[PDB]
């Protein structure tokens, strides 16, 4: 009497892992719950998929977690913590390699 449950895998996870040279708009990681948090030049979509926003190299660090105070769940979970405890969570950054553009000669008046 166990009907259903024949759903296939979601095929989520990390798409462009640390060390991979990544251009603009590429999806870094798709996740179901907040496994990762965005860092520098990294954006998040509505379905909690996590993309690179500038061209560069994907790097994974681990940083402090000091969320927005309107998100009352995480902030109230902060006010359940003792004095020495601060949440650390994993962050994704893209180190930008290619520069902004170059000053070059155009017209010689």
């Amino acid at each position: 009497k166990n009907l259903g449950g024949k759903s296939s895998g979601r095929r989520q996870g990390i798409k462009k892992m640390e060390g991979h040279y990544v251009h603009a708009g590429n999806i870094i990681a798709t996740q179901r719950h907040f496994r990762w948090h965005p860092g520098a030049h990294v954006g998040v979509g509505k379905n909690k998929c996590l993309y690179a926003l500038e061209e560069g190299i994907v790097r994974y660090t681990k940083e402090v977690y000091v969320p927005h105070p309107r998100n009352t769940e995480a902030v109230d979970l902060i006010t359940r913590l003792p004095k020495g405890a601060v949440l650390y969570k994993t962050f994704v950054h893209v180190v930008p390699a290619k520069p902004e553009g170059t000053f070059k000669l155009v017209a010689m008046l």
Partner: protein, 119 residues
């Protein structure tokens, strides 16, 4: 033209700026910083500084906040930083002394809104 750290979306504060004013109101002294994205302090305004401390009655009130607002707005006028992205938490934004700080920023000549990057 230069990039901003446009991400850091889930976490507070947002890093999509070039210069950040951060005010910590301690028990005794209120300070306001103007920073780059590197974490490096560009412009400092502290009541731990005798030239502004000797002209104030108490180093923490609305009066000291208005005084250091005038001081840092002046300082950014001689420092050439003309544009801002400032993020207060919603309970502090409703406070009277730091909305007087925002008014001081507006009258000083430093706009509390950086222009958008040109792509």
């Amino acid at each position: 033209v230069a990039r901003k750290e446009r991400g850091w979306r889930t976490v507070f504060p947002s890093r999509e700026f070039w210069h950040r004013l951060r005010v910590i109101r301690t028990q005794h002294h209120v300070e306001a910083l103007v920073e780059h994205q590197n974490g490096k302090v560009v412009v400092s305004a502290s009541t731990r500084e005798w030239a502004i401390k000797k002209h104030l009655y108490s180093t923490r009130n609305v009066v000291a906040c208005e005084s250091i607002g005038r001081v840092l707005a002046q300082r950014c006028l001689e420092a050439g930083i003309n544009f801002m992205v400032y993020q207060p938490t919603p309970w502090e934004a409703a406070s009277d002394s730091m909305k007087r700080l925002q008014s001081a920023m507006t009258e000083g000549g430093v706009v509390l809104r950086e222009p958008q990057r040109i792509y």
